[PDB]
Amino acid sequence: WVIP
Amino acid sequence: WVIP
Amino acid sequence: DSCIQFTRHASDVLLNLNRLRSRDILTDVVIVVSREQFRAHKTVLMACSGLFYSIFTDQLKCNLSVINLDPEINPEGFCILLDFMYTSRLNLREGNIMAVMATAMYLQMEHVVDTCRKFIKASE
Amino acid sequence: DSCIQFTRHASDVLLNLNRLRSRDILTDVVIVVSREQFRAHKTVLMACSGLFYSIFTDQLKCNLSVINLDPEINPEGFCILLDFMYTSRLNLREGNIMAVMATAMYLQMEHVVDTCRKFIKASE
Numbered sequence: 650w651v652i653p
Numbered sequence: 654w655v656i657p
Numbered sequence: 658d659s660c661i662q663f664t665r666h667a668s669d670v671l672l673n674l675n676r677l678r679s680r681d682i683l684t685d686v687v688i689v690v691s692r693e694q695f696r697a698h699k700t701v702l703m704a705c706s707g708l709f710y711s712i713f714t715d716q717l718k719c720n721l722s723v724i725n726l727d728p729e730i731n732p733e734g735f736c737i738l739l740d741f742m743y744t745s746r747l748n749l750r751e752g753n754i755m756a757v758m759a760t761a762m763y764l765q766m767e768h769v770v771d772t773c774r775k776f777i778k779a780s781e
Numbered sequence: 782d783s784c785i786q787f788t789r790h791a792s793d794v795l796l797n798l799n800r801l802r803s804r805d806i807l808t809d810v811v812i813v814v815s816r817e818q819f820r821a822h823k824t825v826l827m828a829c830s831g832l833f834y835s836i837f838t839d840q841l842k843c844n845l846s847v848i849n850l851d852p853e854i855n856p857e858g859f860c861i862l863l864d865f866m867y868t869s870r871l872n873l874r875e876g877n878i879m880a881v882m883a884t885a886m887y888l889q890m891e892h893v894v895d896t897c898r899k900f901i902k903a904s905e
């Protein structure tokens with residue numbers, strides 16, 4: 650999971 | 654396009 | 658093999674599937690959650706959820722145009738997860754994390770369940 | 782927004798759509814190429830091809846279970862492109878590049894047309  |  | 662690969666292909670496909678959903682094009686099922694209705698594509702739901710995969714591979718249920726979820730399922734939690742299925746983006750907030758995790762457990766969306774567990778553990 | 786994003790989501794969705802294609806699950810159309818038949822999902826074809834997008838948004842054609850391609854279309858070129866649609870991998874070879882490019886132009890798959898043009902230009 651990432652900060653888009 | 655890339656070499657997978 | 659000796660294939661070449663187009664890096665952005667999968668993302669572009671999902672973006673187009675979401676554009677078809679927005680315009681209600683070729684949607685083939687309605688998901689009913691506490692009298693809130695969501696139109697979707699059976700194949701995308703199956704590709705994202707262990708529950709929908711099991712439902713639409715069933716010889717009788719594969720032909721249903723309406724699926725009713727368990728009444729304990731929250732429509733907002735479902736809406737957030739349906740958006741995630743079609744975009745890869747999860748709108749996870751302090752005010753919805755419990756409903757989102759409960760819905761992801763029911764829908765059998767293991768990666769969503771994993772990030773909810775981790776975000777909850779960080780707040781304790 | 783304040784969304785989080787699951788990097789591998791789009792790729793995992795496409796992988797699952799290809800598994801449904803392999804097992805012939807929920808395929809809703811047959812594409813006929815020079816008497817060679819290919820089963821697929823209308824939504825995936827639309828998501829990848831300008832031609833299929835135009836065909837299945839047509840009020841009469843959206844309901845067809847069989848689509849016949851132009852007889853000049855080569856079945857191997859189509860097969861390679863259908864595989865690309867479901868995997869992001871293009872099996873481009875000296876022996877098939879002309880058929881693949883001609884099929885991609887007809888199907889309106891601009892990124893495939895682009896890499897074929899470049900690979901051909903490198904060999905001249």
Ligand SMILES: O=C1Cc2cc(Nc3ncncc3Cl)ccc2N1
Nearest residue numbers: 703704705707710765766767797800
């Ligand atoms: O967490 C998850 C996400 C998910 C998706 C599916 N889908 C499929 N699996 C295998 N072949 C085809 C498909 Cl469509 C099954 C289980 C789970 N569990």
Ligand SMILES: O=C1Cc2cc(Nc3ncncc3Cl)ccc2N1
Nearest residue numbers: 673676827828829831834889890891
């Ligand atoms: O090269 C290409 C690839 C491609 C895909 C599509 N598909 C869609 N476009 C817009 N909204 C939904 C969909 Cl399904 C249309 C044109 C082209 N041209």
Ligand SMILES: [Cl-]
Nearest residue numbers: 766767768769
């Ligand atoms: Cl997931």
Ligand SMILES: [Cl-]
Nearest residue numbers: 890891892893
């Ligand atoms: Cl393309």
